[PDB]
Design an enzyme around this catalytic site. Structure first.
Site, PDB file in Angstrom:
ATOM      1  N   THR A   1       4.604  -3.288   1.643  1.00 43.70           N
ATOM      2  CA  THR A   1       5.189  -4.560   1.242  1.00 43.70           C
ATOM      3  C   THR A   1       5.543  -4.680  -0.240  1.00 43.70           C
ATOM      4  O   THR A   1       4.965  -3.994  -1.083  1.00 43.70           O
ATOM      5  CB  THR A   1       4.209  -5.708   1.611  1.00 43.70           C
ATOM      6  OG1 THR A   1       4.746  -6.965   1.194  1.00 43.70           O
ATOM      7  CG2 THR A   1       2.852  -5.496   0.934  1.00 43.70           C
TER       8      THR A   1
ATOM      9  N   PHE B   1       4.342  -1.776   8.433  1.00 43.43           N
ATOM     10  CA  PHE B   1       4.669  -3.188   8.610  1.00 43.43           C
ATOM     11  C   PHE B   1       4.821  -3.871   7.260  1.00 43.43           C
ATOM     12  O   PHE B   1       4.093  -3.553   6.313  1.00 43.43           O
ATOM     13  CB  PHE B   1       3.524  -3.944   9.303  1.00 43.43           C
ATOM     14  CG  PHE B   1       3.259  -3.542  10.739  1.00 43.43           C
ATOM     15  CD1 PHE B   1       3.818  -4.261  11.791  1.00 43.43           C
ATOM     16  CD2 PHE B   1       2.378  -2.501  11.032  1.00 43.43           C
ATOM     17  CE1 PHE B   1       3.491  -3.952  13.124  1.00 43.43           C
ATOM     18  CE2 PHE B   1       2.048  -2.184  12.351  1.00 43.43           C
ATOM     19  CZ  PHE B   1       2.601  -2.912  13.399  1.00 43.43           C
ATOM     20  N   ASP B   2       5.751  -4.814   7.170  1.00 50.32           N
ATOM     21  CA  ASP B   2       5.847  -5.595   5.945  1.00 50.32           C
ATOM     22  C   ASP B   2       4.780  -6.659   6.208  1.00 50.32           C
ATOM     23  O   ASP B   2       4.236  -6.722   7.319  1.00 50.32           O
ATOM     24  CB  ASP B   2       7.219  -6.245   5.783  1.00 50.32           C
ATOM     25  CG  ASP B   2       7.327  -7.036   4.488  1.00 50.32           C
ATOM     26  OD1 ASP B   2       6.762  -6.583   3.462  1.00 50.32           O
ATOM     27  OD2 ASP B   2       7.970  -8.107   4.492  1.00 50.32           O
ATOM     28  N   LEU B   3       4.462  -7.486   5.215  1.00 49.29           N
ATOM     29  CA  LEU B   3       3.429  -8.504   5.386  1.00 49.29           C
ATOM     30  C   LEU B   3       3.978  -9.896   5.702  1.00 49.29           C
ATOM     31  O   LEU B   3       3.860 -10.371   6.829  1.00 49.29           O
ATOM     32  CB  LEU B   3       2.541  -8.557   4.128  1.00 49.29           C
ATOM     33  CG  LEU B   3       1.383  -9.562   4.065  1.00 49.29           C
ATOM     34  CD1 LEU B   3       0.552  -9.572   5.350  1.00 49.29           C
ATOM     35  CD2 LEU B   3       0.487  -9.191   2.886  1.00 49.29           C
TER      36      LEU B   3
ATOM     37  N   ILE C   1       8.607  -1.744  10.362  1.00 51.69           N
ATOM     38  CA  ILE C   1       8.785  -3.039  11.016  1.00 51.69           C
ATOM     39  C   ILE C   1       8.916  -4.115   9.931  1.00 51.69           C
ATOM     40  O   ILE C   1       8.042  -4.230   9.062  1.00 51.69           O
ATOM     41  CB  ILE C   1       7.574  -3.404  11.928  1.00 51.69           C
ATOM     42  CG1 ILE C   1       7.536  -2.528  13.199  1.00 51.69           C
ATOM     43  CG2 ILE C   1       7.726  -4.843  12.411  1.00 51.69           C
ATOM     44  CD1 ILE C   1       7.687  -1.073  12.974  1.00 51.69           C
TER      45      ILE C   1
END
Ligand SMILES: [Cl-]
Ligand code: NA
Length: 216
Positions: A108, A8-10, A164
């Protein structure tokens, strides 16, 4: 097609961090006597490496962008990172996924030091197997490079993970690492931005994201 990892990115995916980030950019730009009508016009700074943004949107050179990044941090490290919020449904999502057995990772362009403080501050840190961000010096910072290092660090294979994110940078970074990507539109990227980037999947809500991760 069972895969075990979800990256996941932040900013714009897990947290609605626009307030603190746009304020840090405004604080930095104002030091260059650059005024900004409204913070909202700085939303595009949310997601990509700051350097790339200062250079692209203000034509700064390498060294000048670096100075701008430092001003940004003077404010971000102490106030900006807290002018943040977790998107509704996100913690529920993370909990559900770990129950299913998924290993969760943050990949990220945001510096790792800040990303960790933020995720711990919001009490979501333990849902993750690792939080991999950029180095404050920017030597490791593009989406492609952080995802690659995260995968290398955890020995994750391309056929065992997905990415994501909310911006085209996330899609490009995923593609470059041979990972399918799910783009979300509740962040700072648009459906059109993600579709033209090549996003492999596109959702408009955290619940839609949950469903998509599973049927994948
Ligand atoms: Cl940041
Ligand atoms: Na993002």
């Amino acid at each position: 097609s069972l895969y075990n990892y979800v990256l996941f990115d932040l900013d714009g995916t897990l947290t609605d961090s626009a307030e603190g980030i746009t304020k840090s950019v405004k604080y930095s730009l104002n030091k260059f006597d650059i005024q900004v009508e409204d913070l909202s016009s700085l939303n595009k700074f949310v997601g990509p490496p700051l350097k790339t943004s200062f250079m692209e949107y203000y034509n700064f050179d390498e060294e000048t962008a670096t100075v701008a990044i430092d001003y940004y941090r003077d404010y971000f490290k102490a106030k900006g990172m807290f002018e943040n919020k977790v998107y509704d449904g996100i913690e529920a999502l993370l909990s559900s996924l770990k129950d299913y057995g998924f290993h969760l990772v943050v990949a990220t362009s945001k510096p790792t030091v800040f990303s960790k403080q933020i995720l711990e501050h919001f009490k979501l840190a333990f849902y993750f197997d690792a939080i991999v961000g950029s180095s404050l010096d920017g030597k490791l910072s593009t989406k492609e490079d952080v995802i690659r290092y995260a995968m290398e660090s955890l020995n994750i294979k391309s056929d065992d993970a997905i990415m994501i994110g909310d911006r085209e940078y996330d899609v490009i970074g995923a593609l470059k690492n041979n990972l399918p990507s799910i783009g979300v539109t509740y962040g700072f990227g648009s459906y059109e931005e993600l579709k033209n980037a090549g996003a492999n999947y596109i959702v408009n809500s955290v619940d839609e994201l949950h469903k998509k991760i599973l049927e994948l």
